[PDB]
Amino acid sequence: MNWTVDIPILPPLPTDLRTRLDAALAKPAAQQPTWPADQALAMRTVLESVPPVTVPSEIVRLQEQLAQVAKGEAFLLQGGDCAETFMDNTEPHIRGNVRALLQMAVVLTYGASMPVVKVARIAGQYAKPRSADIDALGLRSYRGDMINGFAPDAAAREHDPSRLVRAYANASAAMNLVRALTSSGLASLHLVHDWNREFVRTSPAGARYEALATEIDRGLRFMSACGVADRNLQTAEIYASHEALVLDYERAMLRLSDGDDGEPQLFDLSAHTVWIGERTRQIDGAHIAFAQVIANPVGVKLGPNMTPELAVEYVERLDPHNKPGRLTLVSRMGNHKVRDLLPPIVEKVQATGHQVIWQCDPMHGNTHESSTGFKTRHFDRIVDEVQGFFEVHRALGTHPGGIHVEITGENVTECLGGAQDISETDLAGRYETACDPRLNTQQSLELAFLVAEMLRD
Amino acid sequence: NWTVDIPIDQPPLPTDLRTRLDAALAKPAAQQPTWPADQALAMRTVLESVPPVTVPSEIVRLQEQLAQVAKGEAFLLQGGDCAETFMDNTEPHIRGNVRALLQMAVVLTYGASMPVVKVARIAGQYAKPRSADIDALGLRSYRGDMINGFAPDAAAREHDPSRLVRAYANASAAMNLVRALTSSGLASLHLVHDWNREFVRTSPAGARYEALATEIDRGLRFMSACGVADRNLQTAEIYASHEALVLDYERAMLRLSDGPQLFDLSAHTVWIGERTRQIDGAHIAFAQVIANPVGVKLGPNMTPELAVEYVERLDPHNKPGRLTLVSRMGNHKVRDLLPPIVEKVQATGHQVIWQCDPMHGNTHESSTGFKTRHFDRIVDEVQGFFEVHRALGTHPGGIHVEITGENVTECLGGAQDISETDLAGRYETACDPRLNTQQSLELAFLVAEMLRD
Amino acid sequence: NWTVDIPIDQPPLPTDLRTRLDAALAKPAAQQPTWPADQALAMRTVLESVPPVTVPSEIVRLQEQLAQVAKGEAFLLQGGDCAETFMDNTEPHIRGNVRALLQMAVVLTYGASMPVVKVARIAGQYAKPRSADIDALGLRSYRGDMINGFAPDAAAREHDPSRLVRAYANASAAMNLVRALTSSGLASLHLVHDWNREFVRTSPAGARYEALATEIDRGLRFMSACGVADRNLQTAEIYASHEALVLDYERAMLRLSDGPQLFDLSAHTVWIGERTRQIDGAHIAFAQVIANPVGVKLGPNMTPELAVEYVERLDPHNKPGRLTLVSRMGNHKVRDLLPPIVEKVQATGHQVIWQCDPMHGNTHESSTGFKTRHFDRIVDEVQGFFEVHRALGTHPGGIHVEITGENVTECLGGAQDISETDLAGRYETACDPRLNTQQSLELAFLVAEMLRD
Amino acid sequence: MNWTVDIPILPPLPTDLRTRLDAALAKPAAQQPTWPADQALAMRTVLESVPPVTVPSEIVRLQEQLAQVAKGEAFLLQGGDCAETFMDNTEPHIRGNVRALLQMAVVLTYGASMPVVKVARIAGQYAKPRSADIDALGLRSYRGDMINGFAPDAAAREHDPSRLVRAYANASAAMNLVRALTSSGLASLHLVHDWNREFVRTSPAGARYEALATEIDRGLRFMSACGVADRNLQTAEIYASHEALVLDYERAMLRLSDGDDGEPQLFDLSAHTVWIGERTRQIDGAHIAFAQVIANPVGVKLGPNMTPELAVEYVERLDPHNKPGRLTLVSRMGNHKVRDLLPPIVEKVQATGHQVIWQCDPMHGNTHESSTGFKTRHFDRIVDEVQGFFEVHRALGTHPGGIHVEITGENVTECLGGAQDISETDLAGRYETACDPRLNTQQSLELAFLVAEMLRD
Ligand SMILES: N[C@@H](Cc1c[nH]c2ccccc12)C(=O)O
Ligand SMILES: N[C@@H](Cc1c[nH]c2ccccc12)C(=O)O
Ligand SMILES: N[C@@H](Cc1c[nH]c2ccccc12)C(=O)O
Ligand SMILES: N[C@@H](Cc1c[nH]c2ccccc12)C(=O)O
Ligand SMILES: N[C@@H](Cc1ccccc1)C(=O)O
Ligand SMILES: N[C@@H](Cc1ccccc1)C(=O)O
Ligand SMILES: N[C@@H](Cc1ccccc1)C(=O)O
Ligand SMILES: N[C@@H](Cc1ccccc1)C(=O)O
Ligand SMILES: [Cl-]
Ligand SMILES: [Cl-]
Ligand SMILES: [Cl-]
Ligand SMILES: [Cl-]
Ligand SMILES: [Mn+2]
Ligand SMILES: [Mn+2]
Ligand SMILES: [Mn+2]
Ligand SMILES: [Mn+2]
Secondary structure: OEEEEEOOOOOOOOHHHHHHHHHHHOOOOOOOOOOOHHHHHHHHHHHOOOOOOOOHHHHHHHHHHHHHHHOOOOEEEEEEOOOOOOOOOOHHHHHHHHHHHHHHHHHHHHHHOOOEEEEEEOOOOOOOOOOOOEOOOOOEOOOOOOOOOOOOOOOOOOOOOHHHHHHHHHHHHHHHHHHHHHHHOOOOHHHHHHHHHHHHHHOOOHHHHHHHHHHHHHHHHHHHHOOOEOHHHOOOOEEEEEEOOOHHHHHHOEEEOOOOOOOOOEEEOOOOEEEEOOOOOOOOOHHHHHHHHEOOOEEEEEOOOOOHHHHHHHHHHHOOOOOOOOEEEEEOOOOOOHHHHHHHHHHHHHOOOOOOEEEEOOOOOOEEEOOOOOEEEEHHHHHHHHHHHHHHHHHHOOOOOEEEEEEOOOOOOOOEEOOOOEOOOHHHOOOOOOOOOOEOHHHHHHHHHHHHHHHHO | OOEEEEEOOOOOOOHHHHHHHHHHHOOOOOOOOOOOHHHHHHHHHHHOOOOOOOOHHHHHHHHHHHHHHHOOOOEEEEEEOOOOOHHHOOHHHHHHHHHHHHHHHHHHHHHHOOOEEEEEEOOOOOOOOOOOOEOOOOOEOOOOOOOOOOOOOOOOOOOOOOHHHHHHHHHHHHHHHHHHHHHOOOOOHHHHHHHHHHHHHHOOOHHHHHHHHHHHHHHHHHHHHOOOEOHHHOOOOEEEEEEOOOHHHHHHOEEEOOOOOEEEOOOOEEEEOOOOOOOOOHHHHHHHHOOOOEEEEEOOOOOHHHHHHHHHHHOOOOOOOOEEEEEOOOOOOHHHHHHHHHHHHHOOOOOOEEEEOOOOOOEEEOOOOOEEEEHHHHHHHHHHHHHHHHHHOOOOOEEEEEEOOOOOOOOEEOOOOEOOOHHHOOOOOOOOOOEOHHHHHHHHHHHHHHHHO | OOEEEEEOOOOOOOHHHHHHHHHHHOOOOOOOOOOOHHHHHHHHHHHOOOOOOOOHHHHHHHHHHHHHHHOOOOEEEEEEOOOOOHHHOOHHHHHHHHHHHHHHHHHHHHHHOOOEEEEEEOOOOOOOOOOOOEOOOOOEOOOOOOOOOOOOOOOOOOOOOOHHHHHHHHHHHHHHHHHHHHHOOOOOHHHHHHHHHHHHHHOOOHHHHHHHHHHHHHHHHHHHHOOOEOHHHOOOOEEEEEEOOOHHHHHHOEEEOOOOOEEEOOOOEEEEOOOOOOOOOHHHHHHHHOOOOEEEEEOOOOOHHHHHHHHHHHOOOOOOOOEEEEEOOOOOOHHHHHHHHHHHHHOOOOOOEEEEOOOOOOEEEOOOOOEEEEHHHHHHHHHHHHHHHHHHOOOOOEEEEEEOOOOOOOOEEOOOOEOOOHHHOOOOOOOOOOEOHHHHHHHHHHHHHHHHO | OEEEEEOOOOOOOOHHHHHHHHHHHOOOOOOOOOOOHHHHHHHHHHHOOOOOOOOHHHHHHHHHHHHHHHOOOOEEEEEEOOOOOOOOOOHHHHHHHHHHHHHHHHHHHHHHOOOEEEEEEOOOOOOOOOOOOEOOOOOEOOOOOOOOOOOOOOOOOOOOOHHHHHHHHHHHHHHHHHHHHHHHOOOOHHHHHHHHHHHHHHOOOHHHHHHHHHHHHHHHHHHHHOOOEOHHHOOOOEEEEEEOOOHHHHHHOEEEOOOOOOOOOEEEOOOOEEEEOOOOOOOOOHHHHHHHHEOOOEEEEEOOOOOHHHHHHHHHHHOOOOOOOOEEEEEOOOOOOHHHHHHHHHHHHHOOOOOOEEEEOOOOOOEEEOOOOOEEEEHHHHHHHHHHHHHHHHHHOOOOOEEEEEEOOOOOOOOEEOOOOEOOOHHHOOOOOOOOOOEOHHHHHHHHHHHHHHHHO
């Protein structure tokens, strides 16, 4: 059946912000759903008065934490599903993904010797681009639950604007849980580290990670021995992110800030931070213009065809004021290319004077199709791209700022390798992703161990 | 018709607890909606797998804080809209209401000299009883947005079980925002006190309250002067609550904690109303089975003996703070009716919270046709509630009020001297008349003196 | 003769700082003792290698706190005995005096709404000037226990340089105890406030002070109610001070910090008296060379121009809080004499602390023969000091008083209404009349209102 | 020359405390100086109204911290000079000894994974017993500066009661400094650990201790990474101790407590805690009786002739109320005997039901005379006694509670071995002790490293 919401019935935007927003959205937009303009407008009119998913003073705080990242005084961890679905938007799946990110944070905080800014891909990662409008079954392609349905039939693939509302309801629901969990006990550093201790005990490669787990453990005991005040160990902040892709959803989630802090700006309150993907980063297109008008922190994906010069253009358009950490540039090159392609981008951007975050995405450049027909990534390539991203920064004297991974708390079978030795035949058991293969819980924690050893190197 | 339809798609609680629940839910349930069972079932099935509004470790913490209230070492402040509506579940309304709680809370904490457990009527108060089969307009009565529409038209008033899911979405989106605001600066004690100072400055009776405002300011500066660490001044906990009325909604929102007890995860704490508190009815049998702290409204027809049976039913293990008895008597009846009830419950050896709802027994109709409440009657029920406890050496434990951040004209009186003619300007409640933001801060100050006195 | 002799046994400061010191110390020094140079030297040699009374990082912290006082963001409270004696350097006396500071401090912190830098006249105040060549009894005048004996007999009054070492031992043993008491529970704010409550309860004017006592109590409970972390309520810092008078003692106690500047490590902060503040004399040239915060007493003969030369000499680098100008004018003269001095020093652009000593210009002789001070005159000098600063928009920075924990009868008046006849009962000071414990708490309350007013 | 103090001119002691104290001091007392009774009494009358060196609420606190020790929830470190002197009672020598104890504490806190109760032998360790009244030069023996002079001449050796006063003045002076230093910066955990980092860098055996120093370092950085409240890292408490030997000094430093906490008792305020030595622990003698009347925590030295049965008698006389941590029993057996003699003492005392602190003194049973004529101890024996004290407790299931060592911050040449390889010829350079050989600063820190590895084992 259906539930039903009302299309509703206040000071207008500041004149310059109206002008600028309309000039942004007048530009060409790639990868947009194709539904009618009237039905879209009704849906945006619903979203324009819902309670936001985030609030501006959180975005201001995240921006300050990311400036520390940009200055080399913190490390950025971002991860969660490749594609959230409505049907898997459930308490166990959310807790599971929050717990996996947390588990990784413990180990990276200890390896980096500095705070880790924890950013979940969650509460709105419901839209994807596609290179092909017709997929391999010859159906109109799945573009994520905010657009159409996974089910491999033609009605299910029709673009349905009512998905904008269901996507918001599902997002704000998740966010409520993520906040409940982070403040009420899941994020206690003691509990989360006990889980890491249970992984080291049962993992097939646990003997390799025992020494570092033991050190963290004596580190934690050292704290209670010296009598530190411990409430800061009880809770952590998990922020929300997703690809800003569907411009009808992002424009309708825009809100003007109150001016008490800074003079009023437009924040996208569908998320704390958002990024712009490889297929939508046209320099003069609507997504880059949009990013330029919102106050949030933003990132741009940079793949193997990126030039140093285009990089610098992104930095000048998106960090026009030189605000450390407003712009993250998220390298995804493939492990076999990172060490060649990244260095001259980093040099040209470092010489601008701006302070970007350098972030490694070691997933999206390392995808292949298995003999068994599944889209998969090999753990050792994902690892090796991070290795090589660390080598580039070390050679340059610049900061390996963080990683951006697709992970889950579930024990799926989606990426090959790890300690578990996920084989091509194994992929059949629990291939559950609605899009790209994610590291399972064990694989994601193994990678934090390995990355903790790069941070220590 | 200016709507948009949102499609619904389509492991169970344990057998032993399901067997206990179905036994309790075979009891007759008053005031339930009349939708088809098969549609109710469908909608319960959706809600049995949605992410929860609250989590068990939050409720367990609330129980600890409420235990401290029961024992005379904390004060319970519960307030917000009489009735939430889906169309007024907006960011400025929700903020406004949190703001008004928080401002009352600063003044009450200072006046009590102890912590204040801050519980909003919010993120689910979407259902109400009715006495009237047919309202004045000859329509089926409005029952709250979880049941039907406010709109005085026959189609709006048919009972729609899909509203179960709309209520949930609106409840979680609301709770998301309440969490976000109370963690990220709205619950800064300094900033909330600054709003209290601007009220004292511009209020018409602001002269009367200036002295206490200045003492608070100087109690604040004293903290800074002594160098205390300040992060616990930066944020506050606002718990969620509503009347537990729709048993289709409340049972679907049940979850087992991870150990393992049954919690209702639609709210932190829920109460049973004056019309559904049958000692052998399902609402009571539901309150019995859940581990959340629970409240029961006790109006002027209550007997000591019946208030005891509530205690034996709802607090069988003698957990202080688990049960809150909520007096609502009328200002003219509190001093007489409440003492016997207190004496007899105290004598059981159980520690209940004694909370005053000075709103619901003090409602009258104005010559201009609006349902309304005098400000002075409301105050004087609290004053009396206080006298009762002082006389008996028992704890005046908290209050339960209907308030909003908005500058409505719903209750008469207060410093603004809302008159019978002012009622029409902004009377916006979908149900009972609320204190507006000014009247609710004024009531906090006046109660803060009863605590000091 | 009821004494026991304790034998004395027997790498230097750097050449460049020793060359600076000897240049400054070639200046004439008033009020110095008349013992043989060779004996002075011997005794300086002992004191140049003894463990220090204070350490440089303590003084550096004091300078930071005193900077905050200079800038109008803290208040300076300095008090204790006019003259310490070796035979009254006992555990109950020392505790009593710390106790009396700390109680004044609670009330001043609340009344100021900012932190209070707590500096005792203690652990070295063992030397005094004299005007009189020959006292009334026809004896050489007593000069303080670091110089000679109080005992009115010719042998006691000969200047004994071995008293340099006795002073040091008594100073360090005293400071040991002050550190121990302020770390281990005597400086608990709660417990100190409890003493303040028992004073309000038993004092004859306790009625007058009850309201502020109750506000403090409620500002305290408010902290607990808000859950602040409390370790900074458990202890307090009490710094040491005395008049820097015996240059043989003060120069021997010099040390280089470890980097490197010169500190006098006989005290945290030291002041120059009204009789030794010659602009070209050695006391001033000594204050110039040390890095400690310093004070200069400014009596009714001071000129604006001379108070400026103190600023240029003693605060050459413009370090706020480094220099404290200590007004002591008489209550009848403060309102007239002080404003010009403030205007002219302010105009230099330097930030000095402006501290009131309401004791030394308000001393009179009673018909019963005792040196005494009216309580009301003392209060009214502070009141005036306050009016002066308010008028000019400058900071009334602190006070400097002579107080003890004991229930002496030295100053007239106060709530106890000490009369000319009461003076003989317990007049025990070896020098000037002190506020007793009651009168000193009474003065804190009354000053706390000048701060609130 | 001389300085001069006055022999002075209040509620009498509670009748039972008078009676008990006099009954204690009526018993025979070994090792007491032999000066006239009238001159003694004058000196005690001076001491009876001086400001105490410690106060009762500190002793109450230390007792609570030592009960945690007794329960196995903390570790006790006690050390400083074998014999303080008046002439070396100077700022550098005191800071030096405080710094060395601190440096050791950092490493033991981290090794134990639990707090360390820091107890200095300081501010009154001015008296020693002697087996011989005539020494090897045929002079009346040196008994410590509270009794007579080190100088090897007969006048200097006369017993001089005025030394009771000079001993107090010197003690309270030191204590004032120790308190100044602990609260004002010397005891910052960051500074003290930087010093440990400089030792590991320059020590000849530094490469052996680098790994553990590095772990502590990442542990400390882990704390700032997680944002702990850090004032508890700024300061530490150093307590005062010495051998309670001279009964004229200890009786005159007795003070009655105020009753606000517990009902009034006699505390010895010359120290926080005191111990009774091998030569003065006669079961029915004045020192054991004295210890029984004061409220302080106490210890008794136990050497190789101790029986399990006599041990239990000490426990029943000195911990009559079963108060954990009131009684420490301080094993000194010699490294070659500890593993044989300690176990049956521990079993008999454990079976009483009382909770003593078990403390290792690995110095006093391990002393020998070198070919070069110096009293010396070999580092490897001192180490091996601690090793063996750990082995006894591990085998029993009981708590290796702490160590009691003689150390200094100076780079003296008094104990053979260590990383520095202090040879018999080396002892000549800087043999500075007025009594037994102390570990120098480097040797004391090496031993903390080694003991930290026993705690980790
Ligand atoms: N609050 C700190 C420490 C912390 C608490 N829980 C955590 C879980 C993982 C990592 C760190 C933490 C932080 O978020 O950094
Ligand atoms: N966190 C404390 C104090 C506090 C912070 N913000 C507040 C706002 C209102 C009342 C109290 C507070 C509490 O909830 O009690
Ligand atoms: N430690 C704080 C508060 C405090 C503790 N004890 C006190 C005693 C008196 C005055 C203040 C205090 C301070 O010194 O300011
Ligand atoms: N205050 C804690 C931590 C600490 C501070 N400084 C230290 C120096 C050494 C060891 C520990 C510490 C303690 O004493 O245990
Ligand atoms: N309150 C609005 C919009 C909304 C829908 C779902 C969740 C939150 C808000 C409605 O019910 O139509
Ligand atoms: N994920 C489910 C249930 C749900 C509805 C609304 C909000 C949150 C969850 C859906 O989309 O139907
Ligand atoms: N105050 C006494 C005792 C004393 C001596 C030395 C130090 C401390 C106290 C005196 O000078 O005689
Ligand atoms: N240690 C020296 C100096 C000293 C005297 C008094 C107290 C402290 C130190 C002495 O005994 O003479
Ligand atoms: Cl449009
Ligand atoms: Cl019914
Ligand atoms: Cl002269
Ligand atoms: Cl005797
Ligand atoms: Mn992906
Ligand atoms: Mn109502
Ligand atoms: Mn004086
Ligand atoms: Mn020894």
